[PDB]
Amino acid sequence: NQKFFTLSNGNKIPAVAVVGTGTTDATFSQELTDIVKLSLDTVPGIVHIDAAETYKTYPELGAALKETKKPREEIFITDKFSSLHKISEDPKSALETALNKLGVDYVDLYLIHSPFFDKDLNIDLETAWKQLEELYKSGKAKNIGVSNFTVEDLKKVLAIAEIKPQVNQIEFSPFLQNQTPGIVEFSQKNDILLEAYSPLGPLQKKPDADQQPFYQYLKELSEKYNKTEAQVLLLWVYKRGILPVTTSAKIERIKQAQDIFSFDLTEEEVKKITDLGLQHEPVRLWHVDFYTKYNSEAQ
């Protein structure tokens, strides 16, 4: 039984994203399109896809969307305007291009990918957000939000927003519990849903793990529930009220991630994962050059 979050505007979003596209010069990846197609064909329930302008994989997504029999209503498509490194002039141009390449009429969620705008953009945050407000009003973007925004950045948006941002996609894992200072607490208190990218950071840099309380406990829980370590971590993110966004080239891992809601963790277990995580040194996979200076406040 798939679980959903309810956004501030009453819309539902599947509470895990299981297909990501960001996985060399100008090469269409048959391997990627095939895994996305297979996921859409075989994963039960609403398949939440994370796409982004910066990945340059719209053709592969579009081909998969065309060739699957998965109905459009059973797909939740998140897309992201490339603000850090300009590809399009503005959100309206970016989304129009994306819709055509994907062969779809609307995206379910549209995000500003970064608060750090390319110097070559002739558009400011306010103007970009207002474009997202218009895309929301026209129905080209069913829901709108932001990614990697700090509290100060969100406050700038909130000060000028007619339509309040619904989502802030941040890096979040047991080893990075506040991407930037206080972001989690602020977002949750202001009814902005957090998505957590790279939630499995701990299992992509596993060192002497056998000696470490965190990994010992994670193995204990895996054995208790007969679920993977990954499944336990993804479920923990959900139990923290956050929407985990995951990837994989293994269909069985993709299916396992979708199936995390087949079990539950006790309050004690959630708190223990949190606390053992917080006593670990930060691990940061994204926006490294911008946000390393915040590592000291992450835990």
Side-chain angles (χ1 to χ4, degrees):
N1 273 346
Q2 193 184 58
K3 289 286 190 288
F4 298 76
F5 284 114
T6 318
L7 308 189
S8 49
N9 58 2
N11 291 3
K12 297 176 67 209
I13 180 173
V16 54
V18 174
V19 186
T21 86
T23 54
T24 75
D25 308 13
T27 37
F28 185 102
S29 179
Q30 192 80 58
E31 298 92 299
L32 175 72
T33 196
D34 290 337
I35 177 58
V36 170
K37 161 194 217 292
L38 187 56
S39 311
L40 288 161
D41 286 347
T42 61
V43 170
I46 298 181
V47 176
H48 178 181
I49 302 176
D50 249 298
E53 182 184 8
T54 184
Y55 296 164
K56 310 199 150 199
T57 68
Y58 288 151
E60 296 91 316
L61 283 175
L65 288 178
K66 289 176 186 184
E67 284 136 20
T68 62
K69 276 195 163 61
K70 188 64 156 181
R72 179 62 175 77
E73 280 190 352
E74 301 202 350
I75 306 174
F76 197 82
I77 316 165
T78 311
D79 193 11
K80 311 189 202 75
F81 165 65
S82 191
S83 53
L84 174 57
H85 174 69
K86 162 187 198 172
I87 290 148
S88 304
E89 276 285 303
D90 57 302
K92 261 163 186 157
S93 308
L95 183 66
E96 282 175 19
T97 298
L99 293 187
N100 280 116
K101 293 198 166 183
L102 293 178
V104 298
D105 281 309
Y106 68 105
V107 290
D108 302 65
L109 179 66
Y110 198 38
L111 306 186
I112 300 166
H113 206 6
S114 181
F116 291 113
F117 281 36
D118 209 304
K119 62 207 172 78
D120 287 346
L121 270 188
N122 310 126
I123 188 176
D124 65 351
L125 166 60
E126 269 56 45
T127 303
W129 183 254
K130 293 150 173 282
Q131 285 205 12
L132 267 75
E133 298 198 320
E134 289 311 305
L135 300 173
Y136 180 78
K137 270 206 276 176
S138 76
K140 274 159 206 171
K142 187 176 178 171
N143 298 335
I144 47 165
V146 178
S147 181
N148 305 295
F149 271 40
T150 59
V151 177
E152 293 324 309
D153 306 325
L154 280 176
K155 274 177 174 183
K156 281 181 206 166
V157 181
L158 275 158
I160 289 159
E162 182 156 64
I163 304 297
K164 180 178 154 188
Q166 285 127 24
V167 183
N168 185 17
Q169 184 184 114
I170 52 172
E171 197 183 356
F172 170 106
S173 82
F175 293 172
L176 205 77
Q177 304 213 22
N178 266 299
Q179 178 191 37
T180 62
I183 187 46
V184 168
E185 300 82 334
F186 182 79
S187 302
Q188 287 191 349
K189 287 161 55 183
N190 294 257
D191 194 12
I192 306 167
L193 169 73
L194 295 174
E195 293 180 356
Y197 194 81
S198 90
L200 289 186
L203 306 193
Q204 309 182 13
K205 190 187 169 182
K206 186 146 153 275
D208 304 348
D210 302 1
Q211 292 174 356
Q212 282 199 58
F214 180 76
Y215 293 113
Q216 287 185 0
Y217 187 67
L218 197 64
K219 192 156 85 190
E220 286 174 49
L221 284 190
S222 94
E223 284 165 5
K224 180 180 196 198
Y225 293 128
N226 200 56
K227 300 297 167 197
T228 66
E229 302 169 352
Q231 285 182 295
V232 172
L233 287 174
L234 294 189
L235 191 61
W236 170 79
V237 171
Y238 169 74
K239 297 298 294 174
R240 298 296 313 282
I242 298 170
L243 196 160
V245 168
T246 46
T247 53
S248 181
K250 292 177 178 188
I251 186 63
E252 305 317 316
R253 286 180 179 174
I254 278 184
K255 287 187 172 167
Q256 289 170 306
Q258 178 58 271
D259 201 56
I260 56 168
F261 302 100
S262 71
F263 68 112
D264 201 350
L265 310 171
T266 50
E267 296 177 9
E268 290 184 335
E269 288 162 355
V270 164
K271 167 191 185 165
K272 193 154 183 171
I273 299 171
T274 63
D275 278 299
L276 288 201
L278 287 171
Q279 300 169 15
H280 208 295
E281 293 169 53
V283 170
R284 174 177 291 289
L285 299 185
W286 306 93
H287 272 73
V288 177
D289 280 13
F290 294 96
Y291 285 163
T292 47
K293 82 179 175 183
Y294 291 122
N295 289 358
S296 64
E297 294 198 5
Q299 307 290 72

